[PDB]
């Protein structure tokens, strides 16, 4: 199962209007092509598993990319979904989403929901209707400046840092010490567990500079089903791609890993950055993986729009082989 790479273009921000930028990016959903106008203020075309226009709705993404994958979670296969791109291109919007402000929508009925709310809701829905003894445990670890933080725990201070060591009896696996896996009774529990985590994030933005921009958010869900069956979904929200070129250790390392795998060069540097070691099976491994790439249409972001694209195209080539748990 080759890694699924899919490109998502968001509408022009007011900031791009004020930078004067015109539109350099055309998204073709049918042909699944992205075309970038490099030449002037003539074009380059790329072909991805999916292409998502500026008109893409959150549920759309959920259906095309996420639903199939969660279906493969029920079978007990581990799966990872990356969200990659330049800051402000929409990575957090995809992984999380937002509430409609003047609307009365319940978070489960809200059009603006990103992948995480949606998935969490559905697991309870589908598996209640299935009704077979499921239990859910969700942890979230953010990597900043090569340090590990557990957001989810209430009892821990925002500052405290976990320790990671190569897994015993796994080797491929890694153990993050003191990472809280907080079992979820129900969705109305989901909202609280995530909400406190958002409060911790607000505290830690003040603690660290350009936190929101340089951090990697690794969200993990582990479902226990009876019959036994175990499934694990990693929703990863990467630090902005802009720092990367054609700084961030873990991000730079992720690029190196993708490059090595596509290249076929002998050494792939899993060891170097926390993200690659934790997410090691996500890359050239037994975990089914997809990548949502994110880009801006406006001309001023062109070098970045190209960089993002170059990674995804390259990452298309990489070979994955997923297996049931
Ligand atoms: C429909 C909706 C409503 C509020 C939000 C929102 O702003 N946040 C913050 C939600 C949110 N917070 C998160 C915090 C962390 Cl640390 C990691 C992930 C999330 C996340 O995914 N969300 C979205 C959400 C919404 C409803 C239920 C669960 C998750 C919380 C109110 C739950 C997002 C989507
Ligand atoms: N497809 C989209 N449609 C409308 N607004 C979007 C879309 N993608 C991103 N945005 C908005 O653009 C801004 C940047 O979003 P964010 O997801 O934080 O980017 P990133 O996390 O990649 O830096 C936010 O105001 C966000 O709500
Ligand atoms: Cl705007
Ligand atoms: Cl949307
Ligand atoms: Mg972000």
Residue numbers in the entry: 17 to 57, 62 to 247, 256 to 274, 288 to 366
Provide excerpts from the study.
Human Eg5 (KSP, kinesin spindle protein, KIF11), a member of the kinesin-5 family, is a well characterized mitotic kinesin that is required to establish a bipolar mitotic spindle. Eg5 forms homotetramers that can attach to neighbouring antiparallel spindle MTs and slide them against each other, thus separating the duplicated centrosomes. Loss of Eg5 function owing to RNA interference or small-molecule inhibitors results in the formation of monoastral spindles, cell-cycle arrest and apoptosis. A number of small-molecule inhibitors of Eg5 have been identified, including MK-0731, pyrrolotriazin-4-one-based inhibitors and the quinazolin-4-­one-based ispinesib, all of which are allosteric inhibitors that bind to the unique L5 loop region of the catalytic domain.
Here, we report the 2.6 Å resolution structure of the ternary complex of the Eg5 motor domain in complex with Mg2+ADP and ispinesib. The data for the Eg5–ADP–ispinesib complex suffered from pseudo-mero­hedral twinning and revealed translational noncrystallographic symmetry, leading to challenges in data processing, space-group assignment and structure solution as well as in refinement. Depending on the molecule, the N-terminal 15–17 residues as well as the C-­terminal 2–9 residues of Eg51–368 are disordered, as are a number of loops; in particular, loops L10 and L11 are absent from all four molecules. All four molecules in the asymmetric unit depict the final ispinesib-bound state. Helix α4 rotates and moves by around 7 Å in the inhibitor-bound state compared with the native structure. The benzyl moiety of the ligand is buried deeply in the hydrophobic part of the pocket, where it stacks with the Pro137 ring and makes an edge-to-face interaction with the side chain of Trp127, as well as hydrophobic interactions with the side chains of Tyr211 and Leu214. In addition, the benzyl group also forms an intramolecular edge-to-face stacking interaction with the p-­toluyl moiety of the inhibitor, which in turn stacks extensively with the mostly flat protein backbone of Glu118/Arg119 and also interacts with parts of the side chains of Arg119, Trp127 and Asp130. The chlorine substituent of the 7-chloro-3,4-dihydro-4-oxo-3-­(phenylmethyl)-2-quinazolinyl moiety sits in another mostly hydrophobic pocket formed by the backbone of Gly217 and the side chains of Leu160, Leu171 and Arg221. In three of the four chains (B/C/D) the primary amine of ispinesib is oriented towards the ADP-binding site, and while it is mostly solvent-exposed the amine can interact favourably with the anionic Glu116 side chain.
